[PDB]
């Protein structure tokens, strides 16, 4: 019972969830970094205050 659009996304076998999601996010990481914007140093990922 998968979705019709994302079945074509599945390509290989037994790829760990961590690597899969890391690549998912790294796509946007590279897309944003292509604009030439350096990152800023932050203590953690939440940064609520």
> In the complex with another protein, which residue's Cβ is closer, 2 or 39?
2
> In the complex with another protein, which residue's Cβ is closer, 14 or 38?
14
Total of chain residues touching another protein, rule CB under 8 A: 20
Look up tokens 């996010």; give the residue: 25
Residues in 1-49 at the binding interface with another protein, rule: CB under 8 A:
1-17, 20-21, 24
Compute how many other C-beta atoms are within 10 angstroms of the C-beta atom of residue 29.
13
- With residues binned 3-state (H G I as helix, E B as strand, rest as coil), the percentages for the chain, rounded to 5, are 35, 0, 65
- Length in residues, the chain: 49
**Interaction site with another protein (CB under 8 A):** 1-17, 20-21, 24
């Amino acid at each position: 019972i998968p979705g019709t659009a994302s079945v074509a996304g599945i390509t290989r076998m037994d790829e760990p969830v961590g690597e899969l999601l890391d690549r998912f996010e790294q796509a946007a990481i590279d897309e944003v970094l292509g604009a030439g914007v350096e990152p800023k140093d932050v203590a953690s990922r939440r940064l609520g205050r």
